[PDB]
Structures are given as C-alpha cells and as structure tokens.
C-alpha cells in the first residue's frame, strides 16, 4: 500500500500530536520564549524521563508493517543537530485507522510529541546518524501490525 | 569576586542537577538508547511543558548579581544546534549558599536539567544566538541577590 510522505506542519499533524518548532509561532519577549509547543502527559504514576536515542539512518526504499503506541503517556523526539527525519502516525481507538494513516518528513527545525494513545512507527533516522532528545516514561507499549506500506517520497 | 568557569561534567554537576549527554553513559542496544539522563519533577501540575527559548549571547565581561530558583519544578535546557553555553548554580534552602556556588561551560554536546529548588542564573546564550529546547512547569520563581561575581573563562 503506497504511503505518501508529505512535509510536516502543525496543521497537518495536530490530530496526532504537536510539532515542536519556532517558525511562525507566538512568543513572549523576555530571550524570546516560544511557549507551550508541546504538552507532556505521563500517567500510571510513571516518571517523566529525558533520554537520548542515537538512531542509525535507514536507507531507501522504506517499508513498514506495524505501529506502536503508548496508551498512558506522550512521547517526544527532538533531533539535536538540525537533522531531518521521518514520522508515521495513525489514530484509532483499538487499532490503526488506515484512513488517518499518514507519513511526514521534517524540515530540520522540527521535533514532534505524539499525543497519548497515538499510533506511530519505532524510531529511525534519515540520511545520517541522529541523536534524538527524548521525553517519555521509563517497554509498556501496544504493538499492532498493518498491511505492508511502501513509503513514497516522490510527488 | 572572580567566579572561574570550569568544564561541565556529571560528577561536578550532580549536586545541582543532571547533565544530559551520551559520552561514557550506559545505554541499551535497540538504536542506542541512553536512558534516564535526567528526571523531570513538576509539582502541583499533572503535565510538563515543552518550549524553545531563543537566547541572545551575553555581553562580556559578564558580571552576575542574582540567582533564581523554581521550588515547584526541575528545569531543563538543551541547545538545538550543538552550541556551547554557560550555567551558574548554587544550593541553599533559604538563600544561595556561596560555598556551593559554581560556574560551568559545556562542550557543545551537553544539556542540563536543574534539580527542583536549585539556584541558577536566568538563561543567556554564549557567543551566538542559541535556541534552547526547554522542559519545565511552564510566576513561582524565587530571586535572591548574591555578591557581584565576575565570570572568568579560559
């Protein structure tokens, strides 16, 4: 199944989570504070931990066949050296709702925070080893397979 | 008084917070997951906020005369383009305990998470404008004066 990879934007991503970036975002003059870019929510009396995931770059062509989700907590990933990366998300209360399945490629100035219970693909890098500043709990996530998806970058 | 800025290291910073870095840190082979580098503790709020603070560089010679602290939560700052930055910390339950006053300069591969209630200087960048990914409670900030300190570097 062809899965088109489109540019990431807050507008297109809003139903899946928050896009962490400064472009055209409101800020307070203090230092310029670009506030409330993402809301971290971790329940089940779990801790909110900061980590770094060093991911190897994946090579084209890319195919996926499963998605994971964190039912009781959000998960944020922010590249540490301006790297571009790819994300795949889907909604769905008990399983991925294919009509909402989408893929996005960042612009190098963005991070993401997946809302709780939102389906996404395990972390992987693009074109180069990337260190992702990670904010989540701390494996207690749900794993569900989906029909093979062929990510498409052209067009 | 001259406050000498020294290289930031986890062992020297541990009493004030945690250094967010990968160098010589334990990890899980997955992707290499460098786990639990810092613990976010927020009081009287069930959520943590992520923001970006774009900070201007300080005008040298830098002289400081006050520190701030957040009793209700930890505060993390991680540069987004590998920039080096400077931090000033101190312990003290009532007022800043000067015997614990220290200044550190990062190596470009480090972020910091100030423990809750630890005194530190308001954010500023080093040499160039820097974007700092910020993780904190998102008012409620104590501010106390300290003897005029003159930051000295290499």
CATH architecture designation of domain A2-155 = Sandwich (2.60)
Q: Are the Cβ atoms of B82 and A78 closer than 8 angstroms?
A: no
Q: Which tokens sit at A13?
A: 């991503």
Closest CA to B133 of A78, A23, A52: A78
Task: Report the run of H or E that residue A119 belongs to, with start and end.
Answer: strand A119-120
What single string gives the DSSP state of each residue in A96-146? Answer: --GGG-EEEE--SS-EEEEPTT-EEPPP-EESS-EEEEEEE-----EEEEE
User: What span, in angstroms and rounded, lies between the C-alpha atoms of A12 and A17?
Assistant: 10
Domain boundaries B2-154, corresponding CATH code: 2.60.120.480
CB-based contact, A108 to chain B, within 8 Å: no
Q: Assess contact for A5 and A126: CB atoms under 8 A.
A: no
- Through-space distance between the first and last CA atoms of chain B, rounded to whole angstroms: 17
Is the Cβ pair B54, A32 closer than 8 Å? Answer: yes
Please tell me the distance from the alpha carbon of residue B143 to that of residue B1, in angstroms, as a whole number.
20
Resolution of this entry, Å: 1.6
Q: Token pair for residue B33? A: 């997951």
Whole-number Å distance between alpha carbons of B90 and B149: 13
| Paired strand residues for B134 | B51, B77
SS3 of chain B: CEEEEEECCHHHHCCCEEEECCCCCCCEECCEEEEEEEEECECCCCCEEEEEEEECECCCCCEEEEEEECCCECEEEEECECCCCEEEEEECCCCCEEEEEEEEECCCCCEEEECCCCEECCCCECCCCEEEEEEECCCCCEEEEEEEEEEECC
Are B76 and A50 a contacting pair at CB < 8 A?
A: yes
**How far is Cα A120 from Cα A67, in angstroms, rounded to an integer?**
5
Nearest CB among A22, A111, A123 relative to B31 is that of: A123
**Most A CBs within 10 Å, among B49, B80, B114, to test the A interface:** B80
Both structure tokens of A38: 């993402």
Report yes or no: B2 at the A interface, CB cutoff 8 Å.
Answer: no
Token pair in block for residue B2: 């001259």
Does residue A61 have a cis bond before it (omega within 30 degrees)? yes
Structural determination approach: X-ray
Reduced to 3 states (helix: H, G, I; strand: E, B; else coil), residue B44 is coil
């Amino acid at each position: 199944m062809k899965l088109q990879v489109l540019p990431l934007s807050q507008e297109a991503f809003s139903a899946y989570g928050d896009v962490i970036e400064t472009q055209q975002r409101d800020f307070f003059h203090i230092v310029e504070r670009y506030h409330d870019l993402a809301l971290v929510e971790i329940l089940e009396q779990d801790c909110t931990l900061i980590s770094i995931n060093r991911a190897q770059p994946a090579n084209l062509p890319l195919t996926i066949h499963e998605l994971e989700r964190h039912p009781l907590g959000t998960q944020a990933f922010i590249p540490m050296k301006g790297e571009v990366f790819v994300v795949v998300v889907a909604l769905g209360d008990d399983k991925p709702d294919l009509s909402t399945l989408r893929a996005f490629i960042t612009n190098g100035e963005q991070g993401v925070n997946y809302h709780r219970n939102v389906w996404h693909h395990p972390l992987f890098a693009w074109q180069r080893v990337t260190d992702f500043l990670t904010i989540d709990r701390g494996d207690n996530c749900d794993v569900e397979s989906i029909p093979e998806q062929e990510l498409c970058f052209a067009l």
